[PDB]
Structures are given as structure tokens and as C-alpha cells.
Amino acid sequence: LVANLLILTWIGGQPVEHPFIIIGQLASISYFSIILILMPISGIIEDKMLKLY
Amino acid sequence: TATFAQALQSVPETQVSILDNGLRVASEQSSHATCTVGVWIDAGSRYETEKNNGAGYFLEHLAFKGTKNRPGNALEKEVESIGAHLNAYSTREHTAYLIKALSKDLPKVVELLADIVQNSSLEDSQIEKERDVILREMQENDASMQNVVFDYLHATAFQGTPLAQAVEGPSENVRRLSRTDLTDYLNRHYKAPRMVLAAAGGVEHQQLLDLAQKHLSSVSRVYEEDAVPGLTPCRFTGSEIRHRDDALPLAHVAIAVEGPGWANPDNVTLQVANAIIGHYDCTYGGGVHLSSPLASVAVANKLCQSFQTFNISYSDTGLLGAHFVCDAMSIDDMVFFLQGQWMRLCTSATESEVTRGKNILRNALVSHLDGTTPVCEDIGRSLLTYGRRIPLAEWESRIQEVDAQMLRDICSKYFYDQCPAVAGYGPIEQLPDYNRIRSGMFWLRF
Amino acid sequence: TREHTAYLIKALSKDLPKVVELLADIVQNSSLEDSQIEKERDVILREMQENDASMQNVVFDYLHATAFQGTPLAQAVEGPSENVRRLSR
Amino acid sequence: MLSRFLGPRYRELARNWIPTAGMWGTVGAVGLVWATDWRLILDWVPYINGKF
Amino acid sequence: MTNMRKTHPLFKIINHSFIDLPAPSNISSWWNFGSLLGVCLMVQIITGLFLAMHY
Amino acid sequence: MLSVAARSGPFAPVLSATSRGVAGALRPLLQGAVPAASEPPVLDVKRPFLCRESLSGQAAARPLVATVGLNVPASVRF
Amino acid sequence: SKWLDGFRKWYYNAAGFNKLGLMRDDTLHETEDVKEAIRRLPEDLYNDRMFRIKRALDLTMRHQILPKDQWTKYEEDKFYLEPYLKEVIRERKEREEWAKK
Amino acid sequence: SHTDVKVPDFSDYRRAEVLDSTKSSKESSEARKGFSYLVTATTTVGVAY
Amino acid sequence: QPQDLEFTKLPNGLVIASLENYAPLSRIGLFVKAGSRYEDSNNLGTSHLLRLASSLTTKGASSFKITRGIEAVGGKLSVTATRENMAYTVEGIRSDIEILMEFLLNVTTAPEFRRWEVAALRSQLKIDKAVAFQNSQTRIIENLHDVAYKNALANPLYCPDYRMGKITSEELHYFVQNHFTSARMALVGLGVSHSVLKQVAEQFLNMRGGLGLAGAKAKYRGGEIREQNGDNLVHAAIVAESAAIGNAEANAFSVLQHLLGAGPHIKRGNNTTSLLSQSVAKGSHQPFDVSAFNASYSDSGLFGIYTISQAAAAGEVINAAYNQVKAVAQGNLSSADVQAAKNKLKAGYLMSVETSEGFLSEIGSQALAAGSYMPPSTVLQQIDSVADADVVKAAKKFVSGKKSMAASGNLGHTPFLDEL
Amino acid sequence: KAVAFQNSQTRIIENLHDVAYKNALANPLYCPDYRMGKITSEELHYFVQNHFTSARMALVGLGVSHSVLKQVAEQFLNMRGGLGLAGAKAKYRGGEIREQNGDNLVHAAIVAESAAIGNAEANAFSVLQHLLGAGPHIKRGNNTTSLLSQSVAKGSHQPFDVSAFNASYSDSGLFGIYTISQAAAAGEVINAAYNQVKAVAQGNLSSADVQAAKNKLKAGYLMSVETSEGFLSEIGSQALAAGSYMPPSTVLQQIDSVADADVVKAAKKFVSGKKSMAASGNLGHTPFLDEL
Numbered sequence A: 001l002v003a004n005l006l007i008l009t010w011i012g013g014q015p016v017e018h019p020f021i022i023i024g025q026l027a028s029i030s031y032f033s034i035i036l037i038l039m040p041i042s043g044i045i046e047d048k049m050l051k052l053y
Numbered sequence B: 001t002a003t004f005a006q007a008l009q010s011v012p013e014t015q016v017s018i019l020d021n022g023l024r025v026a027s028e029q030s031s032h033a034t035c036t037v038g039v040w041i042d043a044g045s046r047y048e049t050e051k052n053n054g055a056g057y058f059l060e061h062l063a064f065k066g067t068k069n070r071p072g073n074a075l076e077k078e079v080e081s082i083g084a085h086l087n088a089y090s091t092r093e094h095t096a097y098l099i100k101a102l103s104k105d106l107p108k109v110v111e112l113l114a115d116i117v118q119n120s121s122l123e124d125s126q127i128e129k130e131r132d133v134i135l136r137e138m139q140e141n142d143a144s145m146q147n148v149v150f151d152y153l154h155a156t157a158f159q160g161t162p163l164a165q166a167v168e169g170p171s172e173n174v175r176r177l178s179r180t181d182l183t184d185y186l187n188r189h190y191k192a193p194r195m196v197l198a199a200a201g202g203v204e205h206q207q208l209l210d211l212a213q214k215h216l217s218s219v220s221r222v223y224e225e226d227a228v229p230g231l232t233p234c235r236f237t238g239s240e241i242r243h244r245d246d247a248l249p250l251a252h253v254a255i256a257v258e259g260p261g262w263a264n265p266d267n268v269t270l271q272v273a274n275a276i277i278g279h280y281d282c283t284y285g286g287g288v289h290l291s292s293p294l295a296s297v298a299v300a301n302k303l304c305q306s307f308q309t310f311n312i313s314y315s316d317t318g319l320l321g322a323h324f325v326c327d328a329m330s331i332d333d334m335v336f337f338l339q340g341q342w343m344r345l346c347t348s349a350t351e352s353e354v355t356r357g358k359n360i361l362r363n364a365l366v367s368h369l370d371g372t373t374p375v376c377e378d379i380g381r382s383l384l385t386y387g388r389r390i391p392l393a394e395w396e397s398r399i400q401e402v403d404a405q406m407l408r409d410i411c412s413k414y415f416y417d418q419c420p421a422v423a424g425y426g427p428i429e430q431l432p433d434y435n436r437i438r439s440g441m442f443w444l445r446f
Numbered sequence C: 001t002r003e004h005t006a007y008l009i010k011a012l013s014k015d016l017p018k019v020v021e022l023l024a025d026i027v028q029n030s031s032l033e034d035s036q037i038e039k040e041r042d043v044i045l046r047e048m049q050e051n052d053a054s055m056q057n058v059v060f061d062y063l064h065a066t067a068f069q070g071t072p073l074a075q076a077v078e079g080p081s082e083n084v085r086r087l088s089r
Numbered sequence D: 001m002l003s004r005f006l007g008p009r010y011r012e013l014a015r016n017w018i019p020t021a022g023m024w025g026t027v028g029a030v031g032l033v034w035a036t037d038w039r040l041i042l043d044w045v046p047y048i049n050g051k052f
Numbered sequence E: 001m002t003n004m005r006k007t008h009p010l011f012k013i014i015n016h017s018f019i020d021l022p023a024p025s026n027i028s029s030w031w032n033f034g035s036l037l038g039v040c041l042m043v044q045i046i047t048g049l050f051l052a053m054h055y
Numbered sequence F: 001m002l003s004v005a006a007r008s009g010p011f012a013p014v015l016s017a018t019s020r021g022v023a024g025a026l027r028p029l030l031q032g033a034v035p036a037a038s039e040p041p042v043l044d045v046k047r048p049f050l051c052r053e054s055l056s057g058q059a060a061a062r063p064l065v066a067t068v069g070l071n072v073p074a075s076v077r078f
Numbered sequence G: 001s002k003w004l005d006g007f008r009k010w011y012y013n014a015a016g017f018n019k020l021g022l023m024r025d026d027t028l029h030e031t032e033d034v035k036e037a038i039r040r041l042p043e044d045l046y047n048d049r050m051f052r053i054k055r056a057l058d059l060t061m062r063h064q065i066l067p068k069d070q071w072t073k074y075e076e077d078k079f080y081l082e083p084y085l086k087e088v089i090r091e092r093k094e095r096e097e098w099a100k101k
Numbered sequence H: 001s002h003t004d005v006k007v008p009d010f011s012d013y014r015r016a017e018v019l020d021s022t023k024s025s026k027e028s029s030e031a032r033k034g035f036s037y038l039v040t041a042t043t044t045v046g047v048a049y
Numbered sequence I: 001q002p003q004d005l006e007f008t009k010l011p012n013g014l015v016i017a018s019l020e021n022y023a024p025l026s027r028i029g030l031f032v033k034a035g036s037r038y039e040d041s042n043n044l045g046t047s048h049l050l051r052l053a054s055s056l057t058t059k060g061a062s063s064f065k066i067t068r069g070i071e072a073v074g075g076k077l078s079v080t081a082t083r084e085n086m087a088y089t090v091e092g093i094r095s096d097i098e099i100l101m102e103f104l105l106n107v108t109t110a111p112e113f114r115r116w117e118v119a120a121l122r123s124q125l126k127i128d129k130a131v132a133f134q135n136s137q138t139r140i141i142e143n144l145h146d147v148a149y150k151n152a153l154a155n156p157l158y159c160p161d162y163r164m165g166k167i168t169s170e171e172l173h174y175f176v177q178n179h180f181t182s183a184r185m186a187l188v189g190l191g192v193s194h195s196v197l198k199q200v201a202e203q204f205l206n207m208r209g210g211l212g213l214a215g216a217k218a219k220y221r222g223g224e225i226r227e228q229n230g231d232n233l234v235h236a237a238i239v240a241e242s243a244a245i246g247n248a249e250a251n252a253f254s255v256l257q258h259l260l261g262a263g264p265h266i267k268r269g270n271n272t273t274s275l276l277s278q279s280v281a282k283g284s285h286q287p288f289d290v291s292a293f294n295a296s297y298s299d300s301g302l303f304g305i306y307t308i309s310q311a312a313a314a315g316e317v318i319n320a321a322y323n324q325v326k327a328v329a330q331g332n333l334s335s336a337d338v339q340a341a342k343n344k345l346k347a348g349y350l351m352s353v354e355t356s357e358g359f360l361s362e363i364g365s366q367a368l369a370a371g372s373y374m375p376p377s378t379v380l381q382q383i384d385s386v387a388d389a390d391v392v393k394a395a396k397k398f399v400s401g402k403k404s405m406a407a408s409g410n411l412g413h414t415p416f417l418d419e420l
Numbered sequence J: 001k002a003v004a005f006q007n008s009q010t011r012i013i014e015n016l017h018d019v020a021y022k023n024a025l026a027n028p029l030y031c032p033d034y035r036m037g038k039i040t041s042e043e044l045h046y047f048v049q050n051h052f053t054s055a056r057m058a059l060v061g062l063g064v065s066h067s068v069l070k071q072v073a074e075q076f077l078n079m080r081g082g083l084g085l086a087g088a089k090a091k092y093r094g095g096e097i098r099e100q101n102g103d104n105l106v107h108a109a110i111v112a113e114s115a116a117i118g119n120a121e122a123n124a125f126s127v128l129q130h131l132l133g134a135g136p137h138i139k140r141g142n143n144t145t146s147l148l149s150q151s152v153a154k155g156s157h158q159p160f161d162v163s164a165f166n167a168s169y170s171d172s173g174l175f176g177i178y179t180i181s182q183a184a185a186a187g188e189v190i191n192a193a194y195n196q197v198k199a200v201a202q203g204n205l206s207s208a209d210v211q212a213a214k215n216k217l218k219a220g221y222l223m224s225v226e227t228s229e230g231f232l233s234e235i236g237s238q239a240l241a242a243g244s245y246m247p248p249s250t251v252l253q254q255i256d257s258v259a260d261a262d263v264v265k266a267a268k269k270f271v272s273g274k275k276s277m278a279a280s281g282n283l284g285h286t287p288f289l290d291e292l
């Protein structure tokens, strides 16, 4: 997520040219997916993996 | 097997008969070897005109100190000859003289009651002795803060009316109390059509009717002035009395609203409301798992020493509310929580709480009526208030009609946005101002 | 104490030669036997267990332990329990 | 994780609180209409047809 | 006499906040950063005030 | 006549103690409340005597004499 | 099988609290259920937990760890808060299902 | 005693609808709070305007 | 007419009794011979906390389930305790008796007795002891039992202050596993048929079978205790040893206490027929009350006088009461007063079995002590079969025996036992 | 009061004096819990004006001349009558008190009447008290010359202490046995001490041990007056009790005149007298007065 924020910071100073559109779209999709989806899934995975539940 | 309604149907009916004088003779028969026979008289402290305020209480004192037929303690010896218990009480609206005895001595006890009805000798030395005894027990009853708060609530809730005055009256009335006014009170308030002779237990209604026709015949039947005494309505006043005395360790606060009365049926629904809130004191063993939200909050936050809820009814009037004793440092918070519960019953009364309150009311109504003495009290007060003994099956039918909608409608009718009467006694500095309490009697979210 | 030892008798004036004789032979010819060694070994263990509950003694022993670290002034008069379990004749 | 709020008591509580919430939404709608002078609403009210 | 740090009605806030505030012993250097933010904030204000004096 | 508590007439609730875990529908008479009373002062713990040598001298043999000083701690002798 | 247990042991070593002398049950973030579970603990286990947490804080302050012989092994990692926590969750669920009806 | 504690008359302060101690309340009570909340309501209308 | 009371002696020693009243509410109680008689000096106050632990977590029902289940149906669970036996009674609507019996038997057979729950409950028992000692009769009867008996009945109803914070769950389990055994249980039910009680007793209470730990054998020591607490009134209780329960001398002592004065009969009465009240009223001019105390247990009894009088006039009141009892012991009594005392005793017993809870207490007590039920007519016939010579002999046994005096108040003028 | 009641000897002695007397000696040193917050200054003025009268006080000075003492006496002290209130003669009561407070050690005091101050039997009671044992002389010793400790340790193996309690007043007196024992071993210690005193009362004693007791009593009396505060206390006590000063050599020669038959008579008077018992601790095994 931190490296994705660095990528979005680099893309934001670039014009809308190849290949910055697809890189920026993948960066925003991964940013929202890591914040919303993958982090509670990882928390549940380590909860199972440490025999917590 | 049998269900609850069938078991309430199997309860025997109260037999009621009349006399030529106007006496109401009522009896309930069970299979007990003992019985309770009493006389209930519709003459309390509401019938006095502020110059004879302690008259009925002082009659209750002199009632057991001899008669014309049985002069003095020999009367008492008669009650101790058969092993009988002689009890009495006086209220703001009723007076009762009752005797618990066996059944085999059932004639003579009625005659004894008849003596206390109509031949009460009033010796002047007995007047002075009972005056000293009344002053002694008023200064004893000053120590019990609960009765003081009860009298304060009645004084501030019905100001300017005959319902504000206490049963015992003021001290000066006890000092200047003559005999002529007692004779006048006995003449004009102990008449035959305002009397119920009630028996409960091992009795026969025909034998009791014959004994009432023998002894209790021609009690008064005459108003002696052709002037029937009545009861005007008493105006409820939203007000507040605060007795501040910081030397007491605990504070007692009662908050009430105006009740409906005796004959208004929503009383029953209001009983369910009290059954939702209930009572609590520190000797209970429920902890945080008590069903009442007020009791659970008071246990968890260590708020109150005790609380109770009351629905006191008089002739087309009454009080309806709560009374709690607590330390000073919690008083305001307790008031807040109490008011919240009332508004919960005005807004969000659920079906499970209504069912629990109905079960609690059924348990209270049947569990009160055990033994001959509370059954006899129920008979006497039912013939004096409703004019009839309401059966327990009718109470079960009246309880079954209650759902959550009419419960919150009745609570919105009586509790919501109304001016309360507040009576406080003790370290009541943190007891909130009347504007705060009146603001707490409604919700901005409704 | 941590740097002194005292054995004293208070008596009458008439018994001066006898108390001088007892003070002389107590500090010179004290008889030690192994049964007595173990008897006051368990007695001093119980004395130290009793003295653990006096908080002023514990605090002053702590103060001597932390104010004189690594020196012979840190160790208490009683000593640790391993020594009184291992001291011999 | 709001599966605690599924039951008959919560359903009865919500059913009791529908009309008060609807009335408060009506108050909020009328307050937003009045304070903004919305032309979609005051042109339908018969008395207020003078400023438009 | 008394303790002026803990009994003065103004010094009680500074004592509760920055003097006798219980803090974890094992917090790393990242726990400096927010305090630095506050310092940077007032630095901005100070510089901004002088930039408001000629703009 | 068995049931000792009911056999004793006036001393029925004095010879028997009744409590409840679940409150009844009927409200009890004399609800009662503990007043906020005082508290005993906190004193430091004393030395136990778990050996025979420490108990030597702890037994009283004289009339008890108290002493209160002004800037001297209050003492007592057995 | 045993591969999952060995891979769990590798993750247990990779988590890193065992290098601070901690146990698994000490690493629980204390909610109200965990707070009641700690409140129901016996005094010796409570004192051991307090000392282990204090030692872990002292080691994290110095940015150091215990020596490898003093690391908490995967075998004797006793799960002491699980039965108290299970009864706390069961009682809370009983209160929840009573309040939902 | 505590039974001597008596509330004095408020007849020089009460409203006209509750001056009589013989007639009951709860008949004109809604009119009284309707008047008071009408005063409150028109004040709140004015300050909202 | 309701059905007759019917009994059953189960093979594990349990005695079950049921009467079908066709009552709207049923009351069901278990009576256990597990009072404070069975505590030695190392487990004092265990019975008080066991009395207050009637709503703790059991197997199959938690504290929340027990409280919310009995409180939802409107019924109640209560527990009473003498010095010899306890009684766990529930009551409620007859459609709720199945879950009420389930809750009662789960409470009284297998409590879990968790540590944190009794740690919460010890402050509650302190509050309970404070509320119970708010009056004056309880403390003086407690001290009277402390001085009257040297063992096995000097153990009080309430936990001592040194034991608070010291009762553990282990000794509660030990007390339950010793004294809640099936040979000393009486399961009684009013408003419930014998089939339901029998099937629940056979299905659930086959956990313990033994007789249990007994063998208290209380002994008498006598003496006096004085409590200078500065009250303006002086309370005094002067008793001596007397016969046990279940004997003709117990009936003689009951006739004797109803002759001497056994409580008021008239509200604000003058106590005309009480002999002690007659003697003090002819001797004094101050407010007072003098009654007769009788507590007859299974092995020993205490009989005596109980006076509340002034601080300056306690000596004349106590001396007048003692001289009245001495006059009764010499033979100065008439047969009409003995007949009046017999009628008072018969009426007192019949009023005691009037309500359902007092009746159920009588059922449980007679089922524990005898295994069956005597009808009240047989009890009245046993009362009527007492001669006045037995009353004279009971008074002579009280006078010519060593005494136990408990006194409280301003005892400057209170006489000691040597001066009576 | 709460500080001074940290020692169980204090509570046992207070309860022993409460049980031993009907009046005028059963009043406690320390204020009762009900009296706290209720003692007014008028009662203090009443007590001062009724008991601080002229003929009940002695001014004692050490390191200060007589003339300034007489000047202070005529200046500050001469406005009081002298008698005040007399007293109530301290009648004997007897009996027992038992305090179940849950201590590790059980304290039991069994006492009877003795001689007052000034009688010929008070010195014999003091000689008997030092014969049975009235305190250690060696730090961490075994008390070989104490009869009570030797008799108890003949059959015991647990920590304990037995001493002889003696107290003398102007009109009455108290003499008995003080025992600190274990909870389960209190009966053996109490019975061993009582049997030892009963053996002393039947003449089973050595005259050399009586001589040792006399030497111990003389040594204790001489060590009680070597300090200035003990000297002042003894002078003031003698001036209040008898109104004249007694030199220490006269006290020693009065000690020396005690016969052995007087010691046997004092032990017999203790055995045959009525008892007062004060017990505290775990009293499940502590015996009673009628079980002795």
C-alpha cells in the first residue's frame, strides 16, 4: 500500500500518455482493494493461522 | 390437570347480602379452621374539615380501651380469652377494625366487633393518655423518613384540599382535642350504609348474616341532621417540597403524577407499567442480571439504596410514580434514569416486557390473596371502592386484554408531558430543579 | 550490626565476678555441636521468614543493598538462605 | 457483523420508530425547502406564488 | 504550603498534559512525529504572520 | 408443633434468616438500607511469630499501661 | 497433516512475539470480553502475564530480544486464556440471544 | 411533627383555571400547556425567520 | 375439597410430599438439614454465603439464565435458614412449574461455585449482615446463642466479620457435598401432583446417596454477655436449657410461654392476660415490653424471658419478671389461665398454618423430622393432653437451672446473673 | 485506639478486666466505638473538677530543688478541695469471654483474685509470679528456670509462650496464667500450665527455686528504678498509693521476708478462687472454664 501511494504520487506528476493511464488505473484499483478487501482477509487468515478462532 | 384460568374459575365466589339498615355483609368461605372478621367504614381523614383532623386516628386509639358493655381491659381479656388477634388501621379514606380468630368462637367475635362499632366509651383520662400516646408515636414516626416523604407528597400534591392533611393530623389538634368533636365524628361518620362486615375463611354466610341481624341491627340509619356528607374532588397540583437536612445519611425522593382513580380500568394497565419497573433494595441477589433496566442500572452504577413504584388510588384521583432512597452523590443521575424508563414506556414498550409485566401482575394479584386476612381486606375494600368484589377471573380477563400498544398509549396519557409532584427529604442539594424534572418528563426525540 | 557485635549482661553489683566469668568463657570456649547447628539453622530460617514481613527492615536492607553495591556493606547481617543452609562447623 | 440486530424485538422497535423518523424527515425536508427557496416546491404551494 | 504545579488551576492542565502524563516507555521515534506536526503548525503560523505583514 | 421458627411466636424472623436470589412480585416490608458509615484506619502489618524464640517475651505479665507523648509515638506496655 | 503443523511453527517463529518471551494469549488486544477473561484469571497466571508484558515492553524499549534459549517455544506455549474467553463469549452470546427475542 | 408541615396558599400566583381547590385538574391542563407552548412556538418561529 | 397430602419415601432417602390444592399458583420447596449447626470453627459463615449463592451459575443454567428465567415468568425463588435446616422454595403459576423445578433443583444440587462469583458475593453478604443487624433483637439473640451453647449452636446465622473475604469456593463445595445429601432432603409441593414431583425426583436427584456428615451434638455452657452501646433502652434475654423438639415437655414449655406472655394480641394492647406484663405493670410506670422466649431444636432448647425496658429501670423490670416466673414455678397458677394459654397456643398454631408459605414450611419441617405429616387436629389433641403440673415442672426446670443472660444498652443499673 | 489494638495482648487484657469485675475496674483504657463522636467538653470539665483535686496529686521532681516545687505548688495548685469522688470498690464478677477472630496464635488468660497493694500477700504473689515465670532473661533462650514453660514443653513440640500474669490495685488484684499457643494445641498448653500451678499449690516446689525467684524479683525491681523516668514513676506511684517514700533497700528486705508457705498459700488461693478467662483466636480446641 505504501509503495502504491508512492506510485500514485509519481503518476500524478505525469501527463495522460502511454503507459500512465493503465498504470494509474491499476494503482487506484489496488489502493482501494488493499484498503477495503485484502487487509481484513489477511487479518482473518492470520486469525485462523494462529488458531485464534 | 388444570390451567391457570380454570384454577381461577375454581376459586369460590364472595357472597354479599344486605340489611335493612344498609349494612353490606360479605363473606368468602375456604377450608381453613381460622377466620378473619372485620368491619370496614368509609370514613378516613378526607372527611374532616381541618379542625378535627386527628379525629379518626384518635377514635382508632380509643376503640380498644373499653366500652359501655365491657368496661376496660376486660374487653381485651375477652380477645385474649379465645386467643384472637385484634388489629385495626385508619387511612385517608377507610377505617378498619378486624379480628383474626378460630371458627368455633365465630358468634362472640362478631358481637365484640359490634361493641367497637357502636358503644365505644370515651373516658377523659383515656383521652389524656391516648393524647400522650399519639404524640409519642408521631414523634416515633418522624424517624421513619419513608412515611415523612409519603405525607410530604400528599401535602404538596393535593394542596388546599382535604386530601393534603395527614391521617394523624397536626400536633396542636392533638393538644386541644375535646370529646364533643369525637362524639360528633362518631355520630356523623359511623353510619350503617357506609359499613361492610366482611368475613373470610371458615365461615358460613347464613350464620354470619344471622349474627349481623342480631348484633349489628340498627347501627345508626339516621344522618341526625338530614345532611348527607359527601366527597368533593381534590385538585392535583404539580408542585415541589424540599426538606433539606444534611445531617441525615441518606435522602428519600418521591416523584409522582396524578393517577386515574379506582373505577377507571386503565389502573390495571398502569399496574403492568409498575411491574415493568418493579422494586429493588440492596438485600436482593440478582446482580446485573435483573430484568428491570432501572434496577440493573442502579446495581451496575451503585446508584440507589432502594427504589419502589406505587399506584395509589382514591375516589376519582390518585398518585402514580416512584420513591427511592439513595446517597446524595447519585440523586440527580437516579432521577434521569427513572425518567428515561418512563419515556421508554411512553415510546418503545415492547411485547416481551409487557408479557413479563403481565406475569408479574398475575403473580402479585394471586400471591397477595393468601390467608384469610388479605382476602378479608380485599373484600372490604372492594365493597367500599368498586361497590362489588371483583373476582380473580375478571382480573385475569382484564390482564389478558393488555398489549404493548394500549400500554404505551396509557403511559403517554398519564406520564408523558405532565407536571409531577416531587417530595424530598435529606441531603437533597443534588436533587434537580423543578424545571429540570419537568423537562425530563418529555423527550425531544419523542 | 553490620560492623559491630555485642554480648551484654545486666545484673546486680554483687554478681560482678560471675558475669565477667560468663562473658569471658562465652566469647572464648563456645561449644558448637551439629544438632545445635541444624536446630538454629531452622530457627534462623524461621526468623528470616518472620523478618520478611517487617517492611521497615526490608526497606533498610534494600537501601543498604543498592547504596553499597558490590561491597561488603551490601550484604545483610543475616545473609541469604543458601548460606544458612550451607554454613558448617 | 450486525447480525445481533435481527430479531422480533428490534423489528418491533424499528416499527415503532418509523412514524417519528418519517415526521422528522418531513421537518428536515420542509426546512431545506424553506431555507433555500427551492422553485420546485414553492411554485406548487398556492400562497407562496408571488416571488416567482 | 502546597504544590504549585498540581494545585494551580492553569498549571494543572500543563502538568496533566506535558509534565506528569503517563506515557508508554517503549514508543519509538514515530511517536515524535505528531508533536513535530504541532511545532510545524505554529512555525507556519509565525512565518505566515510575517508574510501577512507585506502581502 | 414442629417448624421451630413458627413454633416461636414473636421470635419467628429473629431465629431464622430469609433471603432471596430472585425478587418476588410482592414488595417486601422494610426494604432497608445501609447508611454510609465510617472506615477503620489503615495500619502497617506487624511481625508474625511463627517460631518459639520470637514468642519469647510476647506473653503479658503486668498491668497494662498506655503512654501518649507529644512528639513521641504513643506506646503501650503489657 | 504434519506439514501444516510445521508451517504453523514456521509462522509462529516468523511472528516474533516469542522472541520477546511472550505467549500467544498475551498478544490479544483487550476488548471487554478479553478484559473480563483477564478479570476471571487466577492470581498466579495474572502475575505471570503482567511480568511477561512488562518484560516485553522493556525489551521493545531497548530494541532488543531475548537470547535464543529464552525464546518461547511452540511446544510449551500453554493456551491459558482460551477456556475463560470461551465462557465469556458464550455468556455474551446468551445475553445477545435473550435481548434479540 | 412532620404533619405540621403545611403548604401556604398560592392564590396570588396561580392561574385562573386552577384557582378552585374543589374542581379537578386535567380538564384545563392541556389548554394551559397549549398556551405556554404556543408562546414558545411563536417565539421559535420569529427567531427562525 | 382438595385432595389429601401424600408422601413417598424414595430408596435414596429422599422424602417427597405433595398436596394437590388445585391452586392458581404452586409453591414447591426443598428442605435440607444443612444449617449452621454443621459448621466447625474453620468454615464459619459458609451457610450464609451458601444461602446467598442461590442465583449463581450451575450446570445447564447460568446466573443470567436463572435470574431472567424466574423473573420472566413472574415467580420467585427464596431461601430461608434456621440454625438447623435450610429451605429453597420457588413459587409461581402452575404452567411454569416445570422450569421452576428445573431451576430449583439445578440451584440446589449442582452449583458450579465459580471463584469470581463468590468474590462478587462477599460484599453482598457484608451488606446483608449490616441490614440484618440494623435492629436490636437479632444481635441480642445472636449473642444469647453465642453464650448459651459452647458448640454447634453458637455458630451464628450471619457470617462473622473476620471471615469476610476468606470463604473460598472449595469449602462451599465441601459443605454442599457433605450436607446436601439425599437422605436429608424433603421435596414438598403445594399445587403440584405427585406424578410430576416423583418423576423429577427420580430423574434428576440420583447424584448423592449417602447419609452425609452429621454428629454436631451441641452442649450447654451458660454465662452472660454485656453490650454497652449507649441506647436509652435496655434489651435483656435471660434463658436456660430446656427439652428438645418432639417431646411432651416441648408442649409444656409452649403452654408455659403462652401463659407467661408470648407476644401481643391487640394493636397497642395493654397485655392484660400476660403474667409478666401484669407483674411489671403493677411494679413500674414506664413503657416496656416483656415476653417469653422459647427456641426448641432437635437436641436442646432455650427457654427464658426477654425484656425491653428503660436504662434506669431495667433492674426492677428484670427482677419483677424473674420473681413472676419463680411464683409460677412454686405453684401459683389457676386452671383458667392454663386453659386460656392452651387456647392461645392452639390458635397460634392454626394461624401459623393459615397461609400457604407457613403451611409449606410446616410440611417440610415435619417431613424432615418425622417422614410423615400429623394432621392439625392431632396436634391440638396433643396440646390438650398437657396437665398444669407439667407447666409447673417446666417453670421449675427453668428456675433451678444455670442461666444465660445477654444484655445490651446502658447497663449501669442492669443486674448481673449473681444478683437474680 | 486502632493503633494500640494492633497487639492482641491489649485486647485480651481489656476483655479480661471487663469480665473480671462488675464495676469500677471493667472500664476500658481506650474509648469505646459508640462513645466516639459523643464525648463532650462538659464531661471533660466535670471529670477535671471532680478528680483533679488537691489531695489526690503528687508533684515529683528530679534535678530540681524543693523550694521552687513548693512555690509552684502554692501558686498553681491551691484552688481545689481534695476529695472529689471516691469510687465503687471494684466488685469481682468472674466468667469468660471468647473472641473468634481468626489469628495464627490463640491467646488465653485465666485469672483469679489476688492481694491488693499493701497486703502481706502481694509480695508473695509477686514471688509466685517470678517462680512460675514472668519474662525471659536470655535472648532466644529456653526458660529452664521457668516452671510453666518447662511443664508445657515437656509434652509440646510447637511454638508457644506461657507466663504468669500479675496485677495489683488499691482494693483488688488479679493473678493468673497467660498462654500463647497454636490453634489446635491450645488445650494441651492450658492444661499443662494449670496442672503445673496445681502442683505448685500442693507444696511440690524447691526452696532453691523460691530463692531464685526472690533474686529475680529483687533484680527486676532494682532495674525498674535505675532510669530517671522509672525512678520518677515509682516515686509518684508510692506517693499516691501510701503517701510516703519507701527506700529500695526496705523493699528488698520486705521481699526477703516472704516465706515459702506464703507462696504455697498464694498458689492455693489462685487454684481455689473463681476464674475469669479471656480467649482470642481460633477457639475450636480452646477449652472452657468448667472443663479445666
Ligand SMILES: CCCCCCCCCCCCCCCCCC(=O)OC[C@H](COP(=O)(O)OCCN)OC(=O)CCCCCCCCCCCCCCCCC
Pocket: A003, A004, A007, A023, A026, A027, A030, G011, G014
Ligand atoms: C532468505 C535470505 C537470503 C539472503 C540472506 C541475507 C539475509 C537477508 C534476511 C534474512 C531473513 C531471514 C528470515 C527472518 C525474517 C522473517 C521472515 C521473513 O521475512 O520471511 C520472508 C517472507 C516470508 O513471508 P512471511 O511474512 O514470513 O509469511 C507469509 C506466510 N507464508 O517473504 C516475504 O515477505 C516476501 C514478500 C514478497 C513480496 C512480493 C510482492 C510482489 C507484487 C508487488 C506489487 C507492488 C506494486 C503494485 C502496483 C500496482 C499498480 C501498477
Ligand code: HEM
Pocket: E041, E044, E045, E046, E047, E048, E049, E051, E052, E055
Ligand atoms: C494562520 C497562519 C498562516 C498565515 C497567516 C499564512 C499566510 C500566508 C501568506 C500570506 C502566504 C502568501 C505568501 C507567499 O507565499 O509568497 C502563504 C502562502 C502559503 N501558505 Fe500560508 N499561512 C498560514 C498557515 C499556513 C499553513 C498552516 C500552511 C500549511 C502547512 C500554509 C501553507 C502555505 C503554502 C503552501 C503557501 C504557498 C507558498 C508558495 O508561494 O509557494 N500556510 N501563507
